[PDB]
Design an enzyme around this catalytic site. Structure first.
Site, short mmCIF file in Angstrom:
data_model
loop_
_atom_site.label_atom_id
_atom_site.label_comp_id
_atom_site.label_asym_id
_atom_site.label_seq_id
_atom_site.Cartn_x
_atom_site.Cartn_y
_atom_site.Cartn_z
N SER A 189 0.79 -1.23 0.00
CA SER A 189 0.00 0.00 0.00
C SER A 189 0.81 1.27 0.00
O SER A 189 0.39 2.27 -0.58
CB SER A 189 -0.92 0.02 1.20
OG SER A 189 -1.63 -1.23 1.30
N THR B 84 -2.20 4.83 2.37
CA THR B 84 -2.70 5.62 1.25
C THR B 84 -3.00 7.08 1.50
O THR B 84 -2.69 7.93 0.67
CB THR B 84 -3.90 4.94 0.55
OG1 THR B 84 -3.69 3.51 0.51
CG2 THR B 84 -4.03 5.47 -0.89
N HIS C 2 -8.28 -9.11 1.79
CA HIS C 2 -7.27 -9.78 2.62
C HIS C 2 -8.00 -10.77 3.52
O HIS C 2 -7.55 -11.90 3.74
CB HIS C 2 -6.55 -8.76 3.55
CG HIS C 2 -5.35 -8.11 2.95
ND1 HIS C 2 -4.24 -8.78 2.49
CD2 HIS C 2 -5.09 -6.79 2.74
CE1 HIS C 2 -3.38 -7.88 2.00
NE2 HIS C 2 -3.85 -6.66 2.14
N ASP D 268 -4.21 0.85 -6.16
CA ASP D 268 -2.77 0.93 -5.96
C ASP D 268 -2.07 -0.34 -6.41
O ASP D 268 -0.88 -0.33 -6.73
CB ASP D 268 -2.45 1.23 -4.49
CG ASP D 268 -3.16 0.29 -3.53
OD1 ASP D 268 -3.02 0.47 -2.30
OD2 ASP D 268 -3.88 -0.63 -3.99
#
Ligand SMILES: [Zn+2]
Ligand SMILES: [Zn+2]
Ligand SMILES: [Zn+2]
Ligand SMILES: [Zn+2]
Ligand SMILES: [Zn+2]
Ligand SMILES: [Zn+2]
EC number: 3.1.3.1
Lengths: 444, 444
Positions: free
Chosen positions: B97, B150, B326, B364
């Site tokens: 990230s 982020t 995740h 991303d």
């Protein structure tokens, strides 16, 4: 817009990883044309989603690399390829090779297993057929056996992709069985369609005897010869060909089944990124120098078909990207994406010189392969590879406990260059592709 | 060229699956602008690859549907996002990230875990910092904790994404610890950056006491107040804000950690698509009616920021798409992708009306989730869902035996609308994004 999308310099320094040289706006504006295409080349990488282009670039060209063919197509978008459930007519989120192939050559969705027919088992014409009717020359090249779904979906309407020849159509496509008043097995309908140039493998099904019609008792090869077909089996003979038309169509059968893969590498394994040494792909020792390459086939075809003044329609397919991706074999899978890239370059080179050609490169559906961290403890089959960057890349196949990794339904890249290429941009559907080509060529 | 990319009618019939109404060439041509953007809105879907956009469309809008925002962006292309190995300076094929967020806000590649610093640990200015300098208003909203990689990567330069507050910086980023003469922790540098509008979660790190400087002994929350920041903690308060500038900056802390997810659903399980019944997501009963929604925060931000005549820069993040991906939880994941679409719609609506705004929507990096055939006997975590088509969709997560599914390195979608958007088309790199924005705004 593009031509050089390789990183600019030192990827560790500011703007060194950048791929853009300058502003694309103007250049992109001078790439948008609605004038009609004269010719069309559709390169299909069977099972080549974004995760497949990336992993092949990373390895063959390195992270900041750039495929001189596959990546050199200016206009881009992502497209959908879901099939349909035969009964309900509900979407089946994961298409197969046939339903997908049928969708871009026909313009109508269908169930998985179907070749050239909608869910009602009704036939619709392929773009190759509409092409031939209009006067254009037509070509179909692939590295898979010609009876395989992708090359076949342009010259055959059948109910199950398993109906390769007479022997199997009588059992699985009784209604298409020639005897039973049907158009015939895939091979037989291929031989009927009579595209100008047809190259690939699958010479074994041509060893079958037709059960009915004008050529019963004669093997399909004999029928082909009887019907005016030029038959070549290797690089040499293919190179010797000087012309291919309706009077003298070309038929090249370079392998019993599928043509061999270029690279050899161990099959991925469980915990192979950890318990096993990184691997480096080496050439395939089985594949002889007599077996043409997708780029040589793609090259000859463009040469023979480019003599037609009305234009031509050509479809090239790098098939084994899919097969090796099923096999969980990173090396065979990468050698195959590289092989296609070369074919794409030959196309792009012609498209550019000619100026009225429309080249489209895409895939029929996404597949299993994923690029994971070097230290990943994954449940499926993993393998570590020595990329060109001198770094290690780990690929993972974790969507099947079976002896075969499956396709997937993720929307994927569709890219093109030439007249009417703007119709590839944004989100679209595999079926819009049929309409994009029909209209670019100005077909009826 | 876009606006409506839904299947035109009956998907079982020829041309009913088509998304294209006509020829894009001209429409697309009349979308290509190189005039300067006055504003910029970057919507990021954390972990939102193509396989994520698909599974959320299939489920929420059906396979032939179309996200009114996420999918309504004309110009599209794919972009790479590989990180760098800190030691060797070789590419690390699968970013995180931070390395990734650093690449688009800074323009230089970096190792994983780094915020605003190259591999030499050298700091580089972010696009928010360069925007503030030029007079433009700045906003940074996200549904994760503000200290998350982020939103942080825009106002913090640190050596480890783990250096949230004073307490852990002294440990992992001692050269950044305020005491040891560093700029401070992520929270602290955020408090210094002082962008006009900052909204998200992570209110727990603001409970930490500063160790040195002007405000030591005080909580970071208290400091925020002392420094002239407006503190809003729920929708009622947010809605109540009438202005946010350098004199009266806005700080919205809506959750201790991350903001709650929108939908609830069982976590994927081993053989869950076969041992278990298809699931249907339900809203999250836990999420208070007082916690703003990404689209609400995106809306208020654009409202306050658009008051600056120089223009504004806003980065919006749909964070939990990644976290749920995740977590192997299709419902939370999809609800979060749906959450972001609404934010994207709010963005486009403004952009279209105003006319000088550039909206970019992307992720991303890629993640674990795969859409597989319903009868799939996968080795990882599977779960079957009841889509809008009344059809069943199976999702797989097979890249980690750990309790967390990993990102993946596949190139993914980057889509934009507005001035300078053509620069998103074709193959590019995550870092090119930085240059496109900097160029669009006319930053030095
Ligand atoms: Zn396929
Ligand atoms: Zn194929
Ligand atoms: Zn396949
Ligand atoms: Zn991320
Ligand atoms: Zn994030
Ligand atoms: Zn993550």
């Amino acid at each position: 817009v593009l031509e050089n999308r390789a990183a600019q310099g030192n990827i560790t320094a500011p703007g060194g990883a950048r791929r853009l040289t300058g502003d694309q706006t103007a250049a992109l504006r001078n790439s948008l044309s609605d004038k009609p295409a004269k010719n069309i080349i559709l390169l299909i990488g069977d099972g080549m989603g974004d995760s497949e282009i990336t992993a092949a670039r990373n390895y063959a060209e390195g992270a900041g690399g750039f495929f001189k063919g596959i990546d050199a197509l200016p206009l881009t978008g992502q497209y959908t390829h879901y099939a349909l459930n035969k009964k309900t007519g509900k979407p089946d989120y994961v298409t197969d090779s046939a339903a997908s192939a049928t969708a871009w050559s026909t313009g109508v969705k269908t169930y998985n297993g179907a070749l050239g027919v909608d869910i009602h088992e009704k036939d619709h014409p392929t773009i190759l057929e509409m092409a031939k009717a209009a006067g254009l020359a037509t070509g179909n090249v692939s590295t898979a056996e010609l009876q395989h779904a992708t090359p076949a979906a342009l010259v055959a309407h059948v109910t199950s992709r398993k109906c390769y020849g007479p022997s199997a159509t009588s059992q699985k496509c009784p209604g298409n069985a020639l005897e039973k008043g049907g158009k015939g097995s895939i091979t037989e309908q291929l031989l009927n369609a009579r595209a100008d140039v047809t190259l690939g493998g699958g010479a074994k099904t041509f060893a079958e005897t037709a059960t009915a019609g004008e050529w019963q008792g004669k093997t399909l090869r004999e029928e082909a010869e009887a019907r005016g077909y030029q038959l070549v089996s290797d690089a040499a003979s293919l190179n010797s060909v000087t012309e291919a038309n309706q009077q003298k169509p070309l038929l090249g059968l370079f392998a019993d089944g599928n043509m061999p893969v270029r690279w050899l590498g161990p099959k991925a394994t469980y915990h192979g990124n950890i318990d096993k040494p990184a691997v480096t792909c080496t050439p395939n020792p089985q594949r002889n120098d007599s077996v043409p390459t997708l780029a040589q086939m793609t090259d000859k075809a463009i040469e023979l078909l480019s003599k037609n003044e009305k234009g031509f329609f050509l479809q090239v397919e790098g098939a084994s990207i899919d097969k090796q991706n099923h096999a969980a074999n990173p090396c065979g899978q990468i050698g195959e994406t590289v092989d296609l890239d070369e074919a794409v370059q030959r196309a792009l080179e012609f498209a550019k010189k000619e100026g009225n050609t429309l080249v489209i490169v895409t895939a029929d559906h996404a597949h299993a392969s994923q690029i994971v961290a070097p230290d990943t403890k994954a449940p499926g089959l993993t393998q570590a590879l020595n990329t060109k960057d001198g770094a290690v890349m780990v690929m993972s196949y974790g969507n099947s406990e079976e002896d075969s990794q499956e396709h997937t339904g993720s929307q994927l890249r569709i890219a093109a260059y030439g007249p009417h290429a703007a119709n590839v941009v944004g989100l679209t559907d595999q079926t819009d592709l049929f309409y994009t080509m029909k209209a670019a060529l100005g077909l009826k």
